[PDB]
Amino acid sequence: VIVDATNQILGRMSTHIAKLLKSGKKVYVVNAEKAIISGPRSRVLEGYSLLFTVKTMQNPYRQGIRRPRNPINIVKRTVRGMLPKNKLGKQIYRNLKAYIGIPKELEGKSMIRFDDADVSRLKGKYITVAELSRLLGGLK
Amino acid sequence: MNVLGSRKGFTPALQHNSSVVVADNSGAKEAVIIGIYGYRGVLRRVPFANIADLVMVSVRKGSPDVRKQKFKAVIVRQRMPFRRPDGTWISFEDNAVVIINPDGTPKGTEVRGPIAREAAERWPKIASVATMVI
Amino acid sequence: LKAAYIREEIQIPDKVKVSLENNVLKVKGPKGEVIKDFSYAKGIRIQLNEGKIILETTFADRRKKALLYSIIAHIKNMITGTINGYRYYLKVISTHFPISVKVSGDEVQVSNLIGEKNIRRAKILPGVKVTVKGEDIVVEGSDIYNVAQTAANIESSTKIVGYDRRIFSDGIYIYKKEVIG
Amino acid sequence: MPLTDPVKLQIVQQRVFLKKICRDCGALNSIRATKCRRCHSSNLRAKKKELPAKK
Amino acid sequence: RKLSSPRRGSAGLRPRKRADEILPTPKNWPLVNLKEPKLLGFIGYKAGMTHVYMIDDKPTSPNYGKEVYTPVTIVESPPILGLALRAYHIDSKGELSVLVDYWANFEEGSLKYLKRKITSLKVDSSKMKEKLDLIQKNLNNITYMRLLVSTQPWLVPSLGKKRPEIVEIQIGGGSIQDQLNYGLSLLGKQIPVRDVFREGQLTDIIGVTKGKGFQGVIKRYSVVEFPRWHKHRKGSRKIGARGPSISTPSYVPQPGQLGFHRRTEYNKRIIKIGDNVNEINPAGGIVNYGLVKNTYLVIEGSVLGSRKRPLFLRYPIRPSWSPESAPKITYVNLASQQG
RNA sequence: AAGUCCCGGCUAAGUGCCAACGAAAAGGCGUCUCCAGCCUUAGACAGCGGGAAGGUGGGCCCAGCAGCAGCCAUCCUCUAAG
RNA sequence: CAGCCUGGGGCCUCGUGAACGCCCUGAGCCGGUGCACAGUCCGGCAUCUCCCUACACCGAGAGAAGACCCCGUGGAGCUUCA
RNA sequence: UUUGCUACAUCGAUGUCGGCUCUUCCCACCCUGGAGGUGCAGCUGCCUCCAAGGGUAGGGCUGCCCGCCCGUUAAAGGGGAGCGUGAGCUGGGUUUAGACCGUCGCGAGACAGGUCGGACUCUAAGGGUAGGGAGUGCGGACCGCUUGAGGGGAAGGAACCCC
RNA sequence: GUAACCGCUGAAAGCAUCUAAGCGGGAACCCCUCCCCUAAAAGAGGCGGUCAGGCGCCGGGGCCUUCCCCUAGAAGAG
């Protein structure tokens, strides 16, 4: 199951990902930097800047630690809170992969969207996940 | 005043309650350092002073009209060795001060003994009455 | 209250070519051309008639009808700019130390204010021309915002005289607008 | 005023009819405003210019 | 009542652990700085220290054009050996991994000193021909070029070792294609120090400091020893309280390892590059080191590490000024260091 | 576990997502709504040009306050105008 | 405003060989709940296993049927105008 | 953050003042940074708003805390952590037993009045912290070089002088 | 990137107006640059090289202790 995250509300999309994960499926989320978050720029940043203790970041993606600031980390951290807290919720979390753009091995495959997470649902004044990570510290 | 713009800072020679000799004919003979002008420090540390520094002193020995009075003075000699920028180490035979008026002119009309040059450069009015400058 | 229907018309004069496509409206004329995006005008239909501009909206509250009449003023400013230019004047006022000002590419440099050795520098927006005659500064252009913002940057940089001093009228100040050219 | 109004009732081009000061928040306002643009107080007053000649 | 006193030590240096290698490499490099292809660092060995008398160069200095006394450190720097060429790119996953390494020792540069560290390539596996065309195929998406260099300790007798140290140094200069050409000319050759630095320049030093073992808190953090009676009274060399709470009782001072840490210095100027060792060797040898017999650097001030410590010298990354040549030296202390 | 349920409206602060559980007097035409009263095509409100006023700038007191410094009246060359 | 040096311990090894803590072994921490300051409960954020030295902040740490205070139709010694 | 009011918890014990040592936090801002007003000429003042990144020291007197005072300083802000911290110290204060004085009591004796003398136990199962070694996983046994998700930082702050 | 705020264009509300839409500036503050620990990051990364040869055996490569030491060191480690 490949999910195209272009012009999709971050929280609304995550709830469909969680149900797909819980049913025993592998979910790939491509274009993870093009999802949107409703609200002005200042409103959204203080939603994420009150988590700050300290600054620096230093590798390829892989950790998932107390402060996500990568477009891949932000999408993965949002889904994790919607998953069960038992041992399955840890096994199921390993079946989710998020990418910036479409990778080379998924180039000619069919992606799905959720019609009730589309950007057409809101009056306006949103930002993209890529713009959020630019201010959080991730170079993206 | 005039030579602080160089590396005006040496070995920390004197403190609060340190005793000095008064190297002029003002009337005093011995004094005790009461305050160091300009120092601002850290927890538990006693403020320090070296050559060419302005200090507040209290005269402990001298003529009746100056005894037990507070004055301003500058340090002119120090026992503890200090190094000039050309790499030479200097050392004197005692710690001494000269008492000045509030505007910087010496209170006495004569200075006894040698004077370091850093004190003569920073305080021109003292250099005018000093006979030998080392 | 809700105004049920409201409709306005803007006449396109001769010697002007108006193009509209995907909410982007560009006006071409003798003095120049201006391009402006109106994607933020939600709930408003912009119609490109053969000889005029048509703006329509229905059931406008106090905020939708406020938006509609600002779009009207923006369009009428674009039409005016491509027929007649915009010209703002700034005056150079000094008390004791004469002020020297010069233009270097896309920057205005102000030196020798009340005596300071710092050089004050102001940005110049695209499509704008700045010249110094004497005791006066002239800012040219077709887009009114760029002409106004550029003249305000010159205004703002020299304010800093307005710190720590009771104002004795030293700086560069805006003067007037709108010569025919 | 060091930042005048471009074509308005601006002053320092040969006038001193300055701005208006809010008494609650302290902000600057127009000479013909009725309330402050920051807090909407209507407790406004004029900036001081100078005493021209005498009594 | 709760006066103010700053904390003891830096909270940014924790953990104070032992360095995991004796020759560290910089993580970050200075920008291009508008030059033509050249290396941005060199490798040296700390010998000793003395003092010279120079005439001041800094035009803003209070002692301008006057003879002043300055301490200096002596760093012995033979030529290094260029081993391989390394290309970096942004791979999939969008990282800064290595594209390929192109080794060249077989044509000239058959060394067994190099086998004391790496049991390096057999004649069978000299298929480096197709590593080079991979670099040229994947040009235009290569971001950095680096050269692997090797020290030559066997040329320093006072430094009683023969196996070398291997590091990689970055090239900064013109275009990427221009840098690839320069890196192929140094490959298998010997790189003098004068091909990198010049007299009067500033540098940054990276190395490991002198080790000191398990230590207390009065030497590790410079805490205050308990005054009077307590100097007599149940133990004085300690801190009183270890925190207030059960909040993971916190980062307060504790005893442990002191010294042998990886550190960095800024803006250390090079005063002289010499070949005639008779102008630097003191009478009776440098105490506890030996005699200099290679090219040496005279670096004013102090340098981290002990004698015979490998030091990485880098271009200044936050330079204070831009010097010109010739800080003229009038006297060098060649007296004995004993007695 | 079961609604990304339906209709009419409001809020732009992340307000809020609180039965028992966490906010007063005061200020806001910020925006949304219902009652009053008073002016409107016999041209309202705002704005713009002019008339924008005269004996007289009357005056008491004053070198003079020539509305507005210490008390105060109150008359038409008038009509599409004071 | 601390530094260096010395004797005996500590540190590593061989031999001899105890005591106190102990519902349990299940004890990372932050905010709460609750007789109102939880290792174990709720919500989160964390957490690969073992070993050595060093430190004593937490375990409302260990040690003693609180000497203070009040009660009991409990005592004992002293006093006198009971 | 005071002092009271209540008597919910602890009486087969949660060591009770002050100081020292060390760590961290709040902001209702004393100084350092930004903006404005003034009955702001300049210098110096006074006031309002943002802001907790850094600083806030040395002494005389008293067991103190508060407070008064001395010489400086950019300023020498004010609070919390079981009035942070006695398995870290101290032992001046306070609350045993000895003794003197004043007042009170027939007396034995009392004071919340003054004064002299008066003990400070413990080898760290667990957690935490500071460091140093092995193992399994990634990944068949090894040699070498690296990246930079993440994490921490105050790594710098301030004053004086020249023009 | 913002705070307090200062400005531009601009209506609601013919005018005016820094704000409502739409823009521009603006702090020892926050994030990056810089310095220190970083592949036990489970998505647990990348790159160069060695593991001869003959018919499971012969033969062989590597690492450690022992040996001489110090840059290091409580034991280990380096």
CB contact under 8 A, C156 and D6: no
Surface-to-core class of residue D27, CB atoms within 10 Å of its CB (0-12 exposed, 13-18 middle, 19+ buried): middle
Alpha-carbon Rg for chain D, nearest whole angstrom, is 12
Quickly give C118 CA vs G78 C1' distance in Å: 98
CB contact under 8 A, A103 and E92: yes
Those residues whose C-beta lies under 8 Å from the C-beta of residue E208, and which sit 6 or more positions away, are E19, E22, E24, E260, E261, E262, E263, E304, E305, E309
Question: CB-hemisphere CA count at 13 Å for E195?
Answer: 19
Cβ neighbours, 10 Å, residue A8: 26
CB-based contact C145:C158 (threshold 8 Å): no
**What whole-number distance in Å separates Cα of residue B30 and Cα of residue B67?**
10
Q: Please give the structure tokens belonging to residue B18.
A: 């340190």
**Which residues 2-61 on chain C approach chain A with CB closer than 8 angstroms?**
40, 42
* Chain E span 79-118 residues with beta carbon within 7 Å of strand H: 86, 88, 95-98, 101, 117-118
**What whole-number distance in Å separates Cα of residue A124 and Cα of residue C39?**
11
* Chain B span 26-65 residues with beta carbon within 7 Å of strand H: 34-47, 56
β-pairing, D28-29 with C120-123?
unpaired
Residue ranges with strand state E in chain A: 2-4, 27-30, 36-38, 96-98, 111-112, 126-128
Instruction: Please report residues of A whose CB lies closer than 8 A to that of E251.
Output: none
**What whole-number distance in Å separates Cα of residue A52 and Cα of residue A48?**
8
Report the phi/psi class of residue B44: left, alpha or beta, with left for phi > 0 and alpha for psi in -120 to 50. Answer: left
Cβ neighbours, 10 Å, residue A126: 19
Question: CB-hemisphere CA count at 13 Å for B87?
Answer: 12
CB-based contact D10:D4 (threshold 8 Å): yes
**What whole-number distance in Å separates Cα of residue A83 and Cα of residue A89?**
6
Tell me the angle at which helices A71-80 and A10-22 cross, rounded to the nearest 10 degrees. Answer: 60
Q: Please give the structure tokens belonging to residue B4.
A: 């602080």
* Chain E span 113-142 residues with beta carbon within 7 Å of strand I: 118-122, 124-125, 127, 131
**What whole-number distance in Å separates Cα of residue C29 and Cα of residue A125?**
34
Nearest to E269 by CA among E315, E329, E225: E315
DSSP for residue B24: B
Phi and psi at residue B65, to the nearest 5°: -80, -10
Measured at the alpha carbon of residue E197, what is the angle toward residues E195 and E198, in degrees to the nearest 5? 105
Reply yes or no: is the peptide bond before residue E192 cis, omega within 30 of 0.
Answer: no
Q: Please give the structure tokens belonging to residue E290.
A: 């030996």
Nearest to C93 by CA among C145, C126, C136, C57: C136
Which other chains touch chain A, taking contact as 3+ CB pairs less than 8 Å apart? C, E
**What whole-number distance in Å separates Cα of residue E319 and Cα of residue E270?**
13
* β-bridge partners, C132: C137
Residue reference for tokens 């840098």: E179
Phi and psi at residue E123, to the nearest 5°: -60, -30
Measured at the alpha carbon of residue D20, what is the angle toward residues D16 and D24, in degrees to the nearest 5? 150
Q: Where are the alpha helices (DSSP H) in C58-124?
A: 64-83
CB-based contact A79:A18 (threshold 8 Å): yes
**What whole-number distance in Å separates Cα of residue E329 and Cα of residue E136?**
48
Surface-to-core class of residue A125, CB atoms within 10 Å of its CB (0-12 exposed, 13-18 middle, 19+ buried): exposed
> To the nearest 5 percent, what fractions of chain E are helix, strand and coil?
10, 30, 60
CB-based contact E269:E20 (threshold 8 Å): no
Residue ranges with strand state E in C22-123: 24-28, 33-37, 45-48, 52-60, 88-93, 100-103, 107-111, 120-123
Q: Resolution in A for the shown PDB structure?
A: 2.7
Alpha-carbon Rg for chain E, nearest whole angstrom, is 24
Q: Specify the amino acid at residue E147.
A: L
Nearest to A82 by CA among A9, A6, A31, A21: A21
**What whole-number distance in Å separates Cα of residue E196 and Cα of residue E305?**
23
CB-nearest to A104 from E92, E94, E95 is E92
Distance from CA of A1 to the nearest CA of C (A): 35
Surface-to-core class of residue A104, CB atoms within 10 Å of its CB (0-12 exposed, 13-18 middle, 19+ buried): exposed
Q: Is B50 helix (H, G, I), strand (E, B) or coil?
A: coil
CB-based contact C107:C125 (threshold 8 Å): no
| A123 CB contact with strand G at below 7 Å | no
DSSP for residue E116: G
CB-based contact C148:C125 (threshold 8 Å): no
Q: Specify the amino acid at residue A54.
A: V
What is the greatest pairwise CA distance in chain E? 77
Residue reference for tokens 């190099």: E114
For chain E, helix (H) and strand (E) counts, in that order, are: 4, 16
| C166 CB contact with strand H at below 7 Å | yes
Q: Is C26 helix (H, G, I), strand (E, B) or coil?
A: strand
Q: Specify the amino acid at residue B28.
A: A
Residue A71: which H helix or E strand, with range? helix A71-80
Cβ neighbours, 10 Å, residue C68: 19
Q: Specify the amino acid at residue A44.
A: V
Report the phi/psi class of residue D31: left, alpha or beta, with left for phi > 0 and alpha for psi in -120 to 50. Answer: alpha
For chain A, helix (H) and strand (E) counts, in that order, are: 5, 6
A120 interfacial to chain C (CB closer than 8 Å): no
* β-bridge partners, B21: B30, B96
Nearest to C151 by CA among A91, D7, B30, E214: D7
Chain D meets chain C (3+ C-beta pairs below 8 A): yes
CB-based contact B82:B100 (threshold 8 Å): no
Give the technique used to solve this structure.
Answer: cryo-EM
Output the 3-class SS for E125-181: CCCCHHHHHHHHHCCCCEEEEEEEEECCHHHCCCCCCCCCCEEEEEEECCCHHHHHH
Cβ neighbours, 10 Å, residue B49: 27
Those residues whose C-beta lies under 8 Å from the C-beta of residue E220, and which sit 6 or more positions away, are E9, E16, E253, E255, E256, E258
Q: Please give the structure tokens belonging to residue E190.
A: 């010997």
**What whole-number distance in Å separates Cα of residue E240 and Cα of residue E251?**
14
Cβ neighbours, 10 Å, residue E139: 14
